Design a protein around this nucleic acid. Structure first.
Ligand SMILES: [Mg+2]
Ligand SMILES: [Mg+2]
Ligand SMILES: [Mg+2]
Ligand SMILES: [Mg+2]
Ligand SMILES: [Mg+2]
Ligand SMILES: [Mg+2]
Ligand SMILES: [Mg+2]
Ligand SMILES: [Mg+2]
Ligand SMILES: [Mg+2]
Ligand SMILES: [Mg+2]
Ligand SMILES: [Mg+2]
Ligand SMILES: [Mg+2]
Ligand SMILES: [Mg+2]
Ligand SMILES: [Mg+2]
Ligand SMILES: [Mg+2]
Ligand SMILES: [Mg+2]
Ligand SMILES: [Mg+2]
Ligand SMILES: [Mg+2]
Ligand SMILES: [Mg+2]
Ligand SMILES: [Mg+2]
Ligand SMILES: [Mg+2]
Ligand SMILES: [Mg+2]
Ligand SMILES: [Mg+2]
Ligand SMILES: [Mg+2]
Ligand SMILES: [Mg+2]
Ligand SMILES: [Mg+2]
Ligand SMILES: [Mg+2]
Ligand SMILES: [Mg+2]
Ligand SMILES: [Mg+2]
Ligand SMILES: [Mg+2]
Ligand SMILES: [Mg+2]
Ligand SMILES: [Mg+2]
Ligand SMILES: [Mg+2]
Ligand SMILES: [Mg+2]
Ligand SMILES: [Mg+2]
Ligand SMILES: [Mg+2]
Ligand SMILES: [Mg+2]
Ligand SMILES: [Mg+2]
Ligand SMILES: [Mg+2]
Ligand SMILES: [Mg+2]
Ligand SMILES: [Mg+2]
Ligand SMILES: [Mg+2]
Ligand SMILES: [Mg+2]
Ligand SMILES: [Mg+2]
Ligand SMILES: [Mg+2]
Ligand SMILES: [Mg+2]
Ligand SMILES: [Mg+2]
Ligand SMILES: [Mg+2]
Ligand SMILES: [Mg+2]
Ligand SMILES: [Mg+2]
Ligand SMILES: [Mg+2]
Ligand SMILES: [Mg+2]
Ligand SMILES: [Mg+2]
Ligand SMILES: [Mg+2]
Ligand SMILES: [Mg+2]
Ligand SMILES: [Mg+2]
Ligand SMILES: [Mg+2]
Ligand SMILES: [Mg+2]
Ligand SMILES: [Mg+2]
Ligand SMILES: [Mg+2]
Ligand SMILES: [Mg+2]
Ligand SMILES: [Mg+2]
Ligand SMILES: [Mg+2]
Ligand SMILES: [Mg+2]
Ligand SMILES: [Mg+2]
Ligand SMILES: [Mg+2]
Ligand SMILES: [Mg+2]
Ligand SMILES: [Mg+2]
Ligand SMILES: [Mg+2]
Ligand SMILES: [Mg+2]
Ligand SMILES: [Mg+2]
Ligand SMILES: [Mg+2]
Ligand SMILES: [Mg+2]
Ligand SMILES: [Mg+2]
Ligand SMILES: [Mg+2]
Ligand SMILES: [Mg+2]
Ligand SMILES: [Mg+2]
Ligand SMILES: [Mg+2]
Ligand SMILES: [Mg+2]
Ligand SMILES: [Mg+2]
Ligand SMILES: [Mg+2]
Ligand SMILES: [Mg+2]
Ligand SMILES: [Mg+2]
Ligand SMILES: [Mg+2]
Ligand SMILES: [Mg+2]
Ligand SMILES: [Mg+2]
Ligand SMILES: [Mg+2]
Ligand SMILES: [Mg+2]
Ligand SMILES: [Mg+2]
Ligand SMILES: [Mg+2]
Ligand SMILES: [Mg+2]
Ligand SMILES: [Mg+2]
Ligand SMILES: [Mg+2]
Ligand SMILES: [Mg+2]
Ligand SMILES: [Mg+2]
Ligand SMILES: [Mg+2]
Lengths: 157, 124, 63, 145
RNA sequence: GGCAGCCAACGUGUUGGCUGGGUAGGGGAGCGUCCUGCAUCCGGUGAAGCCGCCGAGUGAUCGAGUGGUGGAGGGUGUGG
RNA sequence: AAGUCCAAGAGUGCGGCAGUGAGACGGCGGGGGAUAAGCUCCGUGCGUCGAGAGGGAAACAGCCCAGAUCGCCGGCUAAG
RNA sequence: CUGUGGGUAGGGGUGAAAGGCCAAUCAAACUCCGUGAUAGCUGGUUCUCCCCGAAAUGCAUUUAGGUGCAGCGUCGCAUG
RNA sequence: CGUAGACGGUGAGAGCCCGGUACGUGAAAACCCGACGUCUGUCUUGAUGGUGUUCCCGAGUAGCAGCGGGCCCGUGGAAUCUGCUGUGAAUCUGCCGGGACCACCCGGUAAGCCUGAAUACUUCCCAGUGACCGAUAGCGGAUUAGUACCGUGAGGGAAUGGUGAAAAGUACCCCGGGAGGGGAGUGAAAGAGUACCUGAAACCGUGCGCUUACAAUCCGUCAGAGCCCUCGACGUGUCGUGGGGUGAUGGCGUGCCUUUUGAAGAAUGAGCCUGCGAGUCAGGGACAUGUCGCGAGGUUAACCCGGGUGGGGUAGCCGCAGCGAAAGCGAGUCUGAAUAGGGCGUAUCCACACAAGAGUGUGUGGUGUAGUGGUGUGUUCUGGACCCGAAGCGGAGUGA
RNA sequence: AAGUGUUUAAGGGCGCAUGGUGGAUGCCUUGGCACUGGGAGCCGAUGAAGGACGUAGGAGGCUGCGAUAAGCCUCGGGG
């Protein structure tokens, strides 16, 4: 702003008699190099929607995917002990033809998330982290048995 | 998100300057003086578009009066007689008759005089 | 920052159960001997504040 | 299958901001302020009246005091016991909090407004005379804490 | 003959009737600029910018109509 | 008691957002002044200007006519 | 009279006194900071169109070119 | 190919061309960490609960007073804490506090000292990110930048980026003293030539078309002859649903903005162009109105667990009963001696009765009562708060 | 004889075509701005922070260094 830019303390010249506009400092907004008037300052943009709004949006998006048969459960992405983007890609291709998929996996299952992480349209998220934005991106949502059961059980009571 | 206001600013400038072609002086060169002139130009165009219908009626009346007086009748009596006769041609085409073919104008003056009171100054 | 209630107005104005703002009539604190009791008793109790002043009093009360 | 571009605010939700002082087509050269004065550049405080004695200074302060030792009670009317308890039974403070008839940690007094018909055993900090008569004339009993 | 605001009738988009000068000021609906989520499209067979031609819209303005110059990024939809 | 009544876009009540609180001349009733002022101060379901374009008064905010939605190379009128 | 070296500093200095002088400035020097001082005062405030549309009065005022409330505009609701 | 489709560069949009990325591997020395020993210290010529008195328990202190400071508390009835001055005790059936004070009860044990964690910040280093700026912006400083420069001095304080992919940066010839150019070459391009990407406007020329030297012009607008260009048709120059350019001539015509009762005004402001320059943001702020979720309920704050925007978190807050100064009472309550009027309150409506037409009341039934939390908009409060502008006031310094 | 009637451009205006000047616009960037996560939270008589003058085979500026002067030794890395 006007007071944060360097310099500007002096009145530039005498206030009367010079035949020029009355100017209070060289860092005034109308000056080149002067202060910005209503300019951006850092902002926190988060807004806190009620919990059940968020939960309902989750359920509505997941229902929207379910009505159209876009939810899949699988035992796991790839046979374990080692990641393999090739085989996991082939299996996921059998499972769906669309471009974007959510792959909801439990956090412990690292071999599975490693083997599907480098596919261009594939987004990997944890069941306890499920939100409406990622499921609305996905054309299909591909759960694991453990992750589907976990989401069901976190909302069964 | 800072914007450089020059893409949008130049559009009305080009519009007004293109409209101000032919203006003598700096009223065809500078956007501000050209805009000041465009204000007057469009008000004057409105004014004269409204008054053109009166200027042309003035011209038609003048031509009709001259032709009528050539036919030895006054303009006002001529149109009074044409109103009395039911012939309901407007002054525009009555002026085209006065100019283009004077024989039909002569005949129409004959009709107007035939359909006129035996005393135009009678108390009726 | 949270808004501040105008303290001088809170100790003068009050709200009823429905929400109308009541008042206390003036000219009754001293110099009472020459005032008849009819004037004295038409000047006490509460009375609802005027509709003209209801807009500013509300802003002073809520801050 | 709703995707992120299919999302739209509800009709009537979002109103356009009124950007002011952006030309004479809408609100220009004064931004809705009119000509000069105090109000043309700053404001006027809400407790200002032009130097005459303000509304908050020519009126007496309300009589009385506040009594910091006030005992306030959260009140239930007897008619709500009918709705809350279709059969009656024992009804204390905390199994009356669960029915959302009073706040959780407060003193509870029972008042006799509605009409009570069921056999109830009410326990509360205090009772009304009408409430006590309604409780005991309907067949139940009422004990204070 | 064209438009628009209020209202009415059948009825569910028309028709009809009234009305449409305007500063301070109030309300409503929009044009153009930039950044972005998502979706699509165009571009070294030449993007933007600029200069024109020929046009268009009730207004801000438009030209996924066209040429010249130019040399790497843009359009449109729906939200922010 | 009627009239207007697909309108006055009228009253009244509550609320959101106001601007205004320097007015001018002309007609009629008056105070001040010298029954002076293009003076000053009041009254007027008086007007116009302010905030009013168009026609008349040579020119000429406030006088007379008449209230501009746009177009027309139609007609009838008002003051004059 | 003059050179060289030095001393007096801001409500302070110095003045054979003119409010003179104290770095082209002096009824309280200059620089930076408080600080974007405060101004009932002047100036400026940026695209469009649609509908409606004032006031220049009353009352109070350390008041009279400022403001509060009333009157008079607009929008929403109620009544009709 | 992918545990690597991060991001750059390379002659234009590259996962497979380069550096890298995912993922692993590596430290002689120095430093920071732990861990095990020497080492260091203490405890054991010794433990435990009893039964009955004298002494001790932080002294120029507490307390008291005068004058102050600070507490929500501006001297107030003014406690608690505290400075200067004066006076000045007790060692536990003591002394201090519990908002003057006293009594009783309760809590504690001043005038001795150490103390980790949870908390605040970033000169500097490392690694990242941005609905951040993009050369009048962003730091004053993308380039000599606290530089040049201005001042005696404290101090003030600039302006200056872009050839091409690659210098391949124009050999040689010609005019010229050179500068500059013209051929020739380089290059995809020289409308890229180290005055170099794009190259707008103001401003300045040159060429052509129409016009203009008897004429009183806010410089336009409407009508308009003549000339010039262009598109069609018939044909071979004259019309046409035409289009442009210029305009002899005729009618009408008092710039823009501010501010004013009223300005073309001889009131203000503006030489011109290009770039810049003014209602913004924060807050469980307040009021109102949209919209959404849940609904007699609604919602969490700090915080905790999540490489995320997700999930837990009931403390509080608002609604749920009012009247009263208050004790209090409670669909009532206050006033009052009053079943005697009035005030406020009992969502709202419907009916049936019982009383008066002094404005309707009272009562029995029924219907049953709407809030809250996100978020858009308007206004508002606290903040520089729409932007610009004093003369001057204060603090610390610099100057004879 | 009376009457009528084109052609002037010293210079100026407007439209176009062509350039100059100028450095906007577009598209950029060895620069900044706001933060996030770590580290380290002091240096100095064993002479600090910061400088002056010197220093390369050749003139200056920035950087590095100090008469052992774009450097000297030892240990690692790497090529
Ligand atoms: Mg400053
Ligand atoms: Mg001057
Ligand atoms: Mg100042
Ligand atoms: Mg800046
Ligand atoms: Mg949460
Ligand atoms: Mg012309
Ligand atoms: Mg208070
Ligand atoms: Mg008294
Ligand atoms: Mg008395
Ligand atoms: Mg906002
Ligand atoms: Mg305006
Ligand atoms: Mg303006
Ligand atoms: Mg306003
Ligand atoms: Mg102004
Ligand atoms: Mg005024
Ligand atoms: Mg005002
Ligand atoms: Mg205040
Ligand atoms: Mg209609
Ligand atoms: Mg209108
Ligand atoms: Mg009209
Ligand atoms: Mg307006
Ligand atoms: Mg665009
Ligand atoms: Mg978009
Ligand atoms: Mg493509
Ligand atoms: Mg090419
Ligand atoms: Mg762009
Ligand atoms: Mg081309
Ligand atoms: Mg192009
Ligand atoms: Mg938008
Ligand atoms: Mg009528
Ligand atoms: Mg009407
Ligand atoms: Mg009305
Ligand atoms: Mg006044
Ligand atoms: Mg007045
Ligand atoms: Mg008057
Ligand atoms: Mg007068
Ligand atoms: Mg008179
Ligand atoms: Mg008089
Ligand atoms: Mg007069
Ligand atoms: Mg009068
Ligand atoms: Mg006015
Ligand atoms: Mg008029
Ligand atoms: Mg009028
Ligand atoms: Mg008359
Ligand atoms: Mg007639
Ligand atoms: Mg007449
Ligand atoms: Mg001497
Ligand atoms: Mg000296
Ligand atoms: Mg002196
Ligand atoms: Mg000086
Ligand atoms: Mg001097
Ligand atoms: Mg001084
Ligand atoms: Mg002074
Ligand atoms: Mg301050
Ligand atoms: Mg100011
Ligand atoms: Mg109107
Ligand atoms: Mg006073
Ligand atoms: Mg007012
Ligand atoms: Mg209103
Ligand atoms: Mg890449
Ligand atoms: Mg002790
Ligand atoms: Mg004190
Ligand atoms: Mg005290
Ligand atoms: Mg300590
Ligand atoms: Mg800069
Ligand atoms: Mg540039
Ligand atoms: Mg600068
Ligand atoms: Mg110097
Ligand atoms: Mg070649
Ligand atoms: Mg090229
Ligand atoms: Mg150049
Ligand atoms: Mg160039
Ligand atoms: Mg001539
Ligand atoms: Mg004349
Ligand atoms: Mg003319
Ligand atoms: Mg004229
Ligand atoms: Mg003035
Ligand atoms: Mg004025
Ligand atoms: Mg005047
Ligand atoms: Mg002037
Ligand atoms: Mg003049
Ligand atoms: Mg003036
Ligand atoms: Mg001037
Ligand atoms: Mg500027
Ligand atoms: Mg806010
Ligand atoms: Mg109360
Ligand atoms: Mg009494
Ligand atoms: Mg009562
Ligand atoms: Mg709701
Ligand atoms: Mg809201
Ligand atoms: Mg000072
Ligand atoms: Mg000195
Ligand atoms: Mg010529
Ligand atoms: Mg230390
Ligand atoms: Mg050096
Ligand atoms: Mg080695």
């Amino acid at each position: 702003t006007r007071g944060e830019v360097s310099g500007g303390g002096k009145k530039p010249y005498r206030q009367k008699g010079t035949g020029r506009a009355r100017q209070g400092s060289t860092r005034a907004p109308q000056f080149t190099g002067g202060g910005t008037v209503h300019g951006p300052k850092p902002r926190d943009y988060s807004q806190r929607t009620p919990k059940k709004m968020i939960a309902a949006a989750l359920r509505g998006a997941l229902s929207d995917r379910a009505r159209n048969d876009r939810i899949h459960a699988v035992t796991e992405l790839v046979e374990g002990q080692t990641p393999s983007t090739k085989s996991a890609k082939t299996f996921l291709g059998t499972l769906t033809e669309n471009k974007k998929v959510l792959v909801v996996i439990g956090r412990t299952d690292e071999v599975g998330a490693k083997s599907v992480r480098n596919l261009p349209g594939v987004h990997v998220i944890s069941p306890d982290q499920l939100n409406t934005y990622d499921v609305l991106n996905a054309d299909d949502v591909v759960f694991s048995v453990e992750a589907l059961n976990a989401y069901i059980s976190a909302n069964s009571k | 998100a800072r914007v450089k206001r020059a893409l949008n600013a130049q559009k009305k400038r080009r519009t007004v300057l293109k409209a101000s072609k032919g203006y003598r002086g700096q009223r065809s060169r500078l956007y501000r003086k050209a805009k000041e002139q465009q204000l007057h130009s469009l008000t004057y165009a409105y004014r004269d578009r409204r008054a053109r219908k009166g200027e042309f009626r003035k011209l038609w009346i003048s031509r009709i009066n001259a032709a009528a007086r050539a036919n030895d009748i006054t303009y006002n009596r001529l149109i009074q007689g044409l109103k009395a006769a039911g012939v309901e041609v407007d002054r525009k085409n009555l002026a085209e008759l006065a100019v283009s073919d004077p024989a039909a104008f002569t005949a129409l003056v004959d009709v107007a005089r035939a359909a006129l009171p035996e005393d135009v100054n009678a108390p009726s | 920052p949270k808004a501040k209630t105008h303290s001088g107005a809170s100790k003068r104005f009050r709200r009823t159960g429905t929400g109308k703002i009541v008042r206390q009539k003036a000219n009754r604190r001293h110099l009472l001997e020459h005032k008849p009791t009819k004037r004295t008793r038409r000047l006490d109790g509460r009375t609802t504040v005027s509709a003209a002043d209801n807009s500013r009093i509300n802003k002073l009360l809520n801050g | 299958v709703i995707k992120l571009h299919d999302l739209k605010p509800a009709p009537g939700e979002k109103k356009a901001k009124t950007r002011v002082g952006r030309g004479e087509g809408s609100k220009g050269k004064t931004a809705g302020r009119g000509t000069k004065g105090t109000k043309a550049r700053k404001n006027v405080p809400v407790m200002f009246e032009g130097g005459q004695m303000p509304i908050h200074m020519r009126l007496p302060k309300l009589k009385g005091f506040k009594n910091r030792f006030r005992t306030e009670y959260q009140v239930v009317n007897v008619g709500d016991i009918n709705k809350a308890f279709p059969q009656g039974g024992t009804v204390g403070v905390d199994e009356l909090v669960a029915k959302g008839l009073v706040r959780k940690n407060s003193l509870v007094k029972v008042l006799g407004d509605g009409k009570l018909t069921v056999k109830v055993d009410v326990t509360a900090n205090k009772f009304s005379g009408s409430a006590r008569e309604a409780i005991t004339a309907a067949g139940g009993s009422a004990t204070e804490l």
